[PDB]
Design an enzyme around this catalytic site. Sequence first.
Site, mmCIF file in Angstrom:
data_model
loop_
_atom_site.group_PDB
_atom_site.id
_atom_site.type_symbol
_atom_site.label_atom_id
_atom_site.label_comp_id
_atom_site.label_asym_id
_atom_site.label_seq_id
_atom_site.Cartn_x
_atom_site.Cartn_y
_atom_site.Cartn_z
ATOM 1 N N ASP A 108 0.946 -1.396 -0.175
ATOM 2 C CA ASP A 108 0.261 0.286 -0.004
ATOM 3 C C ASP A 108 1.033 1.214 -0.154
ATOM 4 O OD1 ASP A 108 -2.673 1.434 0.577
ATOM 5 O OD2 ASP A 108 -1.284 2.180 2.182
ATOM 6 N N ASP A 139 -2.788 -0.883 5.251
ATOM 7 C CA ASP A 139 -3.077 -0.323 6.328
ATOM 8 C C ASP A 139 -4.539 -0.310 6.291
ATOM 9 O OD1 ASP A 139 -3.258 1.431 4.721
ATOM 10 O OD2 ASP A 139 -2.779 3.080 5.504
ATOM 11 N N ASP A 142 -7.124 -3.104 1.635
ATOM 12 C CA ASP A 142 -6.053 -4.258 1.416
ATOM 13 C C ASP A 142 -6.374 -5.538 2.129
ATOM 14 O OD1 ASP A 142 -4.491 -1.946 0.171
ATOM 15 O OD2 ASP A 142 -4.311 -1.373 2.279
HETATM 16 N N1 LIG Z 1 -13.276 10.396 2.221
HETATM 17 C C1 LIG Z 1 -12.759 10.330 0.808
HETATM 18 N N2 LIG Z 1 -13.833 11.099 0.129
HETATM 19 C C2 LIG Z 1 -13.707 11.184 -1.305
HETATM 20 N N3 LIG Z 1 -12.642 10.510 -1.832
HETATM 21 C C3 LIG Z 1 -11.843 9.882 -1.265
HETATM 22 C C4 LIG Z 1 -11.632 9.704 0.115
HETATM 23 N N4 LIG Z 1 -10.735 8.984 0.409
HETATM 24 C C5 LIG Z 1 -9.957 8.781 -0.691
HETATM 25 N N5 LIG Z 1 -10.532 9.388 -1.885
HETATM 26 C C6 LIG Z 1 -10.337 9.243 -3.192
HETATM 27 O O1 LIG Z 1 -10.495 7.966 -3.698
HETATM 28 C C7 LIG Z 1 -9.694 7.403 -4.418
HETATM 29 C C8 LIG Z 1 -9.432 5.835 -4.373
HETATM 30 O O2 LIG Z 1 -9.858 5.437 -3.145
HETATM 31 P P1 LIG Z 1 -8.837 4.796 -2.089
HETATM 32 O O3 LIG Z 1 -9.420 4.387 -0.963
HETATM 33 O O4 LIG Z 1 -8.184 3.662 -2.729
HETATM 34 O O5 LIG Z 1 -7.815 5.814 -1.771
HETATM 35 P P2 LIG Z 1 -6.452 5.551 -0.761
HETATM 36 O O6 LIG Z 1 -6.163 6.846 0.017
HETATM 37 O O7 LIG Z 1 -6.950 4.490 0.159
HETATM 38 C C9 LIG Z 1 -5.001 5.209 -1.575
HETATM 39 P P3 LIG Z 1 -4.053 3.876 -1.009
HETATM 40 O O8 LIG Z 1 -4.976 2.533 -1.535
HETATM 41 O O9 LIG Z 1 -2.896 3.590 -1.540
HETATM 42 O O10 LIG Z 1 -4.077 3.582 0.545
HETATM 43 C C10 LIG Z 1 -8.324 8.210 -3.748
HETATM 44 O O11 LIG Z 1 -7.471 8.383 -4.743
HETATM 45 C C11 LIG Z 1 -8.842 9.673 -3.246
HETATM 46 O O12 LIG Z 1 -8.785 10.756 -4.201
HETATM 47 MG MG LIG Z 2 -3.147 2.544 2.170
#
Ligand SMILES: Nc1ncnc2c1ncn2[C@@H]1O[C@H](COP(=O)(O)OP(=O)(O)CP(=O)(O)O)[C@@H](O)[C@H]1O
Ligand SMILES: [Mg+2]
Length: 1011
Positions: free
Chosen positions: A351, A702, A706
């Site tokens: 992640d 995390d 995942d």
């Molecule tokens: N509370 C929220 N509200 C609206 N959009 C969100 C959000 N949290 C994340 N996003 C957006 O949704 C997109 C994809 O969702 P995701 O949950 O996979 O982001 P993430 O923060 O977990 C990246 P990673 O998978 O590396 O942890 C993200 O790129 C983000 O721009």
């Molecule tokens: Mg993450």
Amino acid sequence: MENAHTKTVEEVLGHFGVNESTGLSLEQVKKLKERWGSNELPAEEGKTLLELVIEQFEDLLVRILLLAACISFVLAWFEEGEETITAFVEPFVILLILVANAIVGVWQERNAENAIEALKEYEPEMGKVYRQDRKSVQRIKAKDIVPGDIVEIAVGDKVPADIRLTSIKSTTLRVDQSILTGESVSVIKHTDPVPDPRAVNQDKKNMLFSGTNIAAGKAMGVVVATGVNTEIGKIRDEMVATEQERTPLQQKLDEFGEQLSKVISLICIAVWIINIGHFNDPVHGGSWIRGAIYYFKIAVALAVAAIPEGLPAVITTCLALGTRRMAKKNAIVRSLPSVETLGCTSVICSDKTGTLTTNQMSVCRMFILDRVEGDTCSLNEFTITGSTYAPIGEVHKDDKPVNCHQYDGLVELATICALCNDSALDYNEAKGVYEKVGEATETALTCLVEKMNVFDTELKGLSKIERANACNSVIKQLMKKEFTLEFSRDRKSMSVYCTPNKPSRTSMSKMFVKGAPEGVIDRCTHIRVGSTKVPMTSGVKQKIMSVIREWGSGSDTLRCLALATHDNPLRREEMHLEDSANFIKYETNLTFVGCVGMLDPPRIEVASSVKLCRQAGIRVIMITGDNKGTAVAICRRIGIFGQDEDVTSKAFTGREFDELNPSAQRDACLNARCFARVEPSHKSKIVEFLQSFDEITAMTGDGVNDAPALKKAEIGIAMGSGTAVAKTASEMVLADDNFSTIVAAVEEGRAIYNNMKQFIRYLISSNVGEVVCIFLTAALGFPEALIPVQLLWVNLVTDGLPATALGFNPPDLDIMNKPPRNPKEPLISGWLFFRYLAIGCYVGAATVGAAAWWFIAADGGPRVSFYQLSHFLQCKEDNPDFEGVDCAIFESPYPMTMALSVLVTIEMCNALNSLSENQSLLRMPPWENIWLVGSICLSMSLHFLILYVEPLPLIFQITPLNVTQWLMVLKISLPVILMDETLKFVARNYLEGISWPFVLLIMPLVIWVYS
Ligand SMILES: Nc1ncnc2c1ncn2[C@@H]1O[C@H](COP(=O)(O)OP(=O)(O)CP(=O)(O)O)[C@@H](O)[C@H]1O
Ligand SMILES: [Mg+2]
Ligand SMILES: [Ca+2]
Ligand SMILES: [Ca+2]
């Protein structure tokens, strides 16, 4: 309050006198803490001392020595039964080696449990509550939660106590309660009471149980039971001994253990057979059954000597060492096979957000539309100072301090960030720092609203606590939030339906949308410039996306988020909010307001960890749901890519990966190093594609996105500051979020296997020399150089502690430079089989030559020729071939002592060879393993003890040696080091840092022995 699921929400809140809005008081918590106590379960004692000892004697290799000790007892009790001097010494030396390995195994197993238990209190379990100290949510310790307080819980959280659901904020709430009821699906909950007072936990809706996790949604409720009064606490007696499957390396040692016991039995049968002509010899009294029993004891004593009886114990202490060594590096190892499997890991999927980055986000710049030309648009790009969650920062237009009230687009941008937000900001008076309550992406927006302060409010007379949610409370007082279309990773967006409280303007309700800038802007048909709305074109669409692409790919590598509003949304009645696929159908025709970019700095230890994994043959892949431009820019920072490396076929998106037939989709998964914008469905799909190539995959994550991939990977590594859903699906947890602990777990898993191969090399190179000693004597016709009690003394001294001390061996010098190991290859190699035979053939020939030396070349012994030594049984006073030879010297204890002393000494020098597979003793001196030095000095002390202590030479049928005969023992024992230094030399040069304090230490010894 034991049946809360049968009562109305108003009836349960009335029972405690608590309100769901203001929360519980502090005079109430003090009274409830006295009557109910802390919210914690008593510490379990685990495996007791007796149970931990019984597990040592449950393997086949230990059960043979138990039966052989019984055979040696019933065979020595029928002859001279009432005795303790020399009869029951053979069963005693067989039991000492069993209790010696059982003590080390139990003591090392007890140490690993103590270190793991001391790691549970690294960071206390927390819980969000509403209490009358603050008008916002505050994080408290889970143990300080009393029955009757309002607890707020969101996605990924672990339910702190039994909670009667009061209000569900999202459209639905899913709970993973396999820990309690055993169902492997997320259960939908509600707030209505169930009528049945005796409903089963599967039927107890509107109730959340301690220890379970929230799979999806956000809700609040009132705690009804804490501590031992919860459903998971009332069943802590129903904890049966789970069938812990053997480590995949233990299955290799069990198959090798039974294959070795089969060949050892054939060897011991042969010993009894090749000695048929010696049964009726005058030594045994001329009786056949008397001689047959004597050689049955030699075969039994040879089975104990040849069998590795410390093998099931040394694998116990090695796995126990790996668990204690990881707990000292703040790493909770839940599954025992996990640390061993990391030593064979070929791919590490990771992640990005919160795992490869510190998750300390902070909105540092934003922009709104200044004015629209008609084809292009000018953007009012701002910047914000501050890198922590503290609401202390300044907004700058062009590096000049600016006020946010004069920009109506900034007033609207702050409104979207305040309402479309399921998080908050908490002050920590104990730590003196502002910490987040919820996700880092949303708290960064909560703290931005405080810095902007679009509605200029007096922020000077407020305390540190009331300054965390001061500007947000002002915005939430103007709009009434109706419902929330919660964030789903299929649309990568989230909207909130708010209604203005002011009836003067009589404004219709709006939908404030925030989400990924790629998808949200595509659903935007208008753009908000200043305070007016102008239709969006494709020319201004390129200007907005180009700025966002500069933010992600720039130096700061920002994590961007677009903010939009829907001016004319449908009513709540027309919207069907049961399912989640209709949420994207309501987030259409939006009005773009602005975008924010928050910085997420990578962890300091990540850049050096990626460099060590690449050297160890491991491949690091970033599986993120964030933008591709942000992901590739982070990969260039942490070392996955170079700052100018071309990534045209190494970085893919979820859409680009799906638009590929299984032909190219396969050859792209082993060559790629970055996957961006992937759903939780894709992450587990990437992990299973990598396992299709017979690769050990280790997923690190995390969040709840995942957990599907953490379950499919061979090893799942969760961060300590991550969600509880990820930590449940994981085998190892990084309590301190140290990414460098992962490569230490790989080095440790490789060390467990290395210590195993050195243990096998020592007990096969040596025990073959004890078997060759007996057959070489028989094929030469020499007198027997060993009796059963001496075959059992060699087992005690050599196969005991000097063999278990090999589990404490230091890591190799090239431990993390070799490619990962394939767990499908055989245990022992063909080259290793030659190294075992080459050393054993010398150990056997040296023991026979030591006895043959005294009979032929020693001064104190007779100068008997080779013929007379080979035909010693045919010697009488009437034979012309034996003149002057007193043929009672062939039963002398001198050659049996020379052989017993050479066997013990040559196996102590063979233990010094078992510190590394290929590194010489001059490169890794024996003091790098001080447990082996102490074990050898103890084994030599016990050997010198039975040679010179009052009654002992008689019990073992040996005689004290002088300094001249002890120099001969060393003359033959030392070349076993030179032979293995040669075999180590060939493996380094033709198959695959000299310590001068050690060379200068052994030279006075080497010249002394050989003159
Ligand atoms: N509370 C929220 N509200 C609206 N959009 C969100 C959000 N949290 C994340 N996003 C957006 O949704 C997109 C994809 O969702 P995701 O949950 O996979 O982001 P993430 O923060 O977990 C990246 P990673 O998978 O590396 O942890 C993200 O790129 C983000 O721009
Ligand atoms: Mg993450
Ligand atoms: Ca043995
Ligand atoms: Ca041995």
